[PDB]
A paper describes a structure:
Reduced glutathione (GSH) provides the cellular first line of defense against oxidative stress-induced injury, which can be maintained by NADPH generated mainly via the pentose phosphate pathway and its rate-limiting enzyme, glucose-6-phosphate dehydrogenase ([name]). Accordingly, missense DNA mutations that impair [name] activity or stability result in increased oxidative stress and a spectrum of disease phenotypes featuring, most commonly, hemolytic anemia, and collectively called [name] deficiency.
Canton [name] is prevalent in China and Southeast Asia (50–60% of the variants), causing severe deficiency (class II). Recombinant Canton [name] enzyme showed only 18% of normal [name] activity with lower KM for both NADP+ and G6P, which is consistent with the biochemical characteristics analyzed using blood samples derived from subjects carrying the Canton variant. Furthermore, the Canton variant was less thermostable; its T1/2, the temperature at which the enzyme retains half of its catalytic activity, was 42.6 °C, which is 4.6 °C lower than T1/2 of WT enzyme. However, we noticed a loose helical interaction between the helix (αn), containing the Canton variant-R459L, and an adjacent helix (αe), which was not described in previously reported structures. In WT [name], R459 forms electrostatic and hydrogen bond interactions with D181 and N185 on the adjacent helix (αe), whereas Canton mutation does not, resulting in loosened inter-helical interactions and displacements of the helix (αe) and a proceeding loop consisting of K171, P172, F173, G174, and R175, several amino acids away from R459-interacting residues on the helix (αe). Canton [name] was more susceptible to degradation by chymotrypsin relative to the WT enzyme, which corresponded with a significantly decreased enzymatic activity. This suggests that Canton [name] may undergo higher conformational fluctuation, leading to a greater accessibility to proteases and its reduced thermostability.
Author numbering:
A (entry chain C): 28 to 514
B (entry chain L): 28 to 513
The structure:
Amino acid sequence: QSDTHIFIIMGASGDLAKKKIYPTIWWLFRDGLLPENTFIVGYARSRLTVADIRKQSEPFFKATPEEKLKLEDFFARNSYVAGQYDDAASYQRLNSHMNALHLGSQANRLFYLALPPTVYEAVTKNIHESCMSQIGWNRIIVEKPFGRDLQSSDRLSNHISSLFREDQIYRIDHYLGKEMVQNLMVLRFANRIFGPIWNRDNIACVILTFKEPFGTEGRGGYFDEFGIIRDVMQNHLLQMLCLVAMEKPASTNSDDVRDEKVKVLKCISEVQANNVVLGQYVGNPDGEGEATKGYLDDPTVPRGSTTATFAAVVLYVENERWDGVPFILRCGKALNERKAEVRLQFHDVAGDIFHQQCKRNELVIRVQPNEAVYTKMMTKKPGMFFNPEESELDLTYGNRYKNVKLPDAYERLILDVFCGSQMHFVRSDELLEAWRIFTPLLHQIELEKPKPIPYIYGSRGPTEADELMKRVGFQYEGTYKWVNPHK
Amino acid sequence: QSDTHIFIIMGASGDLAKKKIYPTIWWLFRDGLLPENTFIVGYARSRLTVADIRKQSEPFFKATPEEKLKLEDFFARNSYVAGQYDDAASYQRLNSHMNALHLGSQANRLFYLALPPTVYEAVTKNIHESCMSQIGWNRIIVEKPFGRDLQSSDRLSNHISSLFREDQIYRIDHYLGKEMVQNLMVLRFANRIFGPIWNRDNIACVILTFKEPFGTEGRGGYFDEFGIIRDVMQNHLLQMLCLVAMEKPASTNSDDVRDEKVKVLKCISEVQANNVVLGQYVGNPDGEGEATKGYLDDPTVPRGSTTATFAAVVLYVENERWDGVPFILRCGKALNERKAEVRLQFHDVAGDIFHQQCKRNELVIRVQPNEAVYTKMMTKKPGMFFNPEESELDLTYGNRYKNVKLPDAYERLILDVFCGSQMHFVRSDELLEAWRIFTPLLHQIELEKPKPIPYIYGSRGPTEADELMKRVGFQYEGTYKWVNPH
Ligand SMILES: NC(=O)c1ccc[n+]([C@@H]2O[C@H](COP(=O)([O-])OP(=O)(O)OC[C@H]3O[C@@H](n4cnc5c(N)ncnc54)[C@H](OP(=O)(O)O)[C@@H]3O)[C@@H](O)[C@H]2O)c1
Ligand SMILES: NC(=O)c1ccc[n+]([C@@H]2O[C@H](COP(=O)([O-])OP(=O)(O)OC[C@H]3O[C@@H](n4cnc5c(N)ncnc54)[C@H](OP(=O)(O)O)[C@@H]3O)[C@@H](O)[C@H]2O)c1
């Protein structure tokens, strides 16, 4: 209905807040998607005013001059409270400030933790002691739900769970807010053309890909603590794997869906080192600008670091649907393109009557850029020719839906929290299983410090990764030629 | 491939020859697709010269001025022989003329029967005394129509068969030479995404469609003898049905493929009248030109005619793959568009979790115009929206293959005859089965003369046809919106 909502941005002065959260909540406000009675409260160490956080963040709002009236109305709904992250008195002031807003004691409260995770423990304790509505609901959004290692994450998880119910905790994986990632469920479960085919009798392998064309861009020091597997694979690619592999849920209820995601992960064995390839980028002497510098040429990165900037890992789901089908998770920085993508490669047809001219069908869901889905298949070569040739059936959102704005993942996810939908957020048991799967590998890496394989900035990464894909059953012939039609 | 070939156009002065056959053989010649030692011989009643048939046919060649050298070379390989169709002496002259060409007694001979079918019997008898190579092969190409009912077709078939072996007879159904019709086999059997889904457990119905937007165009008299079922359904749509329904052949050998087509038809029961809707177009008083005239306003059409210009018929294939799946054959003249198309509508997904917002998937293979294949499916509605919406995965040859000429069906088929491939040609037993399926219905129509349902020129036809489709399981909601991605 028209209840009052308070959106509290913890860490309001920090960069996640100023470049992403404040702009996102502004976009939702200006499109009429928030409850009419919404207030925004910033909280952080510095002693700021609203005018300060406005000056600091409005640069990222992309505000047209036509939006000035709405922009005034948005900042009239903003306030700020200065406080330390582990000072009970500061949180008492925050709670009073909230109770002093229109219907504050009654309002629903939404706490966005846009802070360093080293402080999550203190902030969650203090929010739960001083700041919960006695009447409205209380939800917290946790931005980095993974710690460094199973033990440190698990203690943080038990801490949060001893205070907050699972239906109050919204753990972010921002890929779950992307257009095509959400589309996986509909593509799979709303269509018969993809149902009977979606199993080990027809799928030869699955490939989940994340590529960025830039390196650590002078901020390698923050990255070096994590490495590419923690940064991108254990969270984003594993989430994509679940959506591709899950059985059909009893309904689209949040917990029916997340049950099926967790069920998939429970059937994955711990990754074996024999199925892993690690890489680290070096500079391209023939490139320009940042491309000439290797990972180790960033002076914020410890000298000699063996941290991986590229990884390819093969996982198996041991259940009736997927037994033996390799899931290849492939990710890296400083590669040849920006791309995130899901690919299924189907088996050869049985009983070939075309004299080995057929290639394997593939289904591709491209998450970014240029959101698209397409299916690579065989058609009779056009013209006076009898023989088959690869082509595709295509849906490209930029052509087919020219005028439709696809929202940023954070717009969608923040809105889901106002709505009470946990479906696109990571559940505790999902987190635990992700840790189980990767922990032995990560522990072995930390102990043995293996030297990753060098690859040149701007390339596709270590050729060993392609050999790994080939070994487990992916085929690449390089004969497919695509010419853009809507050009 | 380095032997001598003789292409004989019987009925060289007639219109099929001048507008279609002479140009087609020219196109094959100019693209380098014929054997290097090929001669073209015309034969017909009139006393013409090559210069005559050139003047008469070159208008349809679409010859650029750059092609003059090849055009000269083509006509230097042409000749003409005048003769009657039932005169032993005329065929003796034709045979001598052929023996006098380069290696003629040895050459392979390809007879194109571009004549009225009232003369097939005489021409075939005379060719197979007189004109066969004793050394090379001998093949004849027969255009439609192959009898009006089972009895007349069967007598014609037995006549031709008592002279010629089945591997000498090339019965044309020109749809089998079209790009997307030939593509049906590859789409189905080269791809795993279409294999497991291609059966009664996943397909709710199949729809085979032929639409023309013009009526009989003042030549209704010729049409009235046949009606739309004989003109278009028993041949073109039934052939499409076979390609859509056949089991995977042992190979792409002609006879392995045609075996599977015949096997499908052997499992089809005789059509019952309760599964048929017939229509006849009437004029649109609000239109212009030909569109204001009904079928009966053509003065070449007999007064009172009840002949159908539209028909929708439901067939069933009673075998393990298709039991109970309705195949809807829908065709008509004077409709709202030109279109030939195959559509599969898949069943609803079981265990709906989307609150009845899903629509049935469809696979469409569009034969003409704008050759394309697309699959209508559900995607999450783009933007800030949770719910499914129809979209499609598309392949449109005009965009994807901008620079690729798709040949005319006759180019491809004539070339197949030079090559000895009977795969895209109608076999005797296919013909017999098509007659078995339709003959009782056609006999009932001729006896009871039911009055077909009127429909206005330029419409989609009788609304009773849509009711028939709905009754047997096709669903149409009309919610799908397609915008061209240019
Ligand atoms: N709607 C559309 O926009 C649309 C539709 C169809 C095709 N296309 C475009 O056409 C191009 C081809 O499409 P595609 O990539 O799906 O087909 P593809 O060229 O066959 O690439 C398929 C997969 O093979 C990988 N690969 C490349 N070289 C390899 C090697 N030596 N060993 C092992 N794997 C190798 C690629 O790696 P990487 O991922 O690392 O490249 C990719 O994962 C792409 O640029 C695509 O964006 C676009
Ligand atoms: N690559 C492409 O060019 C491409 C791709 C996708 C879509 N499109 C276009 O988008 C449009 C719609 O596509 P579509 O025809 O596949 O889907 P559709 O319009 O949903 O048509 C589906 C079928 O339902 C029939 N129908 C129409 N009204 C009916 C009624 N009242 N009761 C029962 N049946 C009825 C149509 O008949 P008729 O056949 O008699 O119309 C057609 O056979 C078409 O213009 C199509 O050309 C084009």
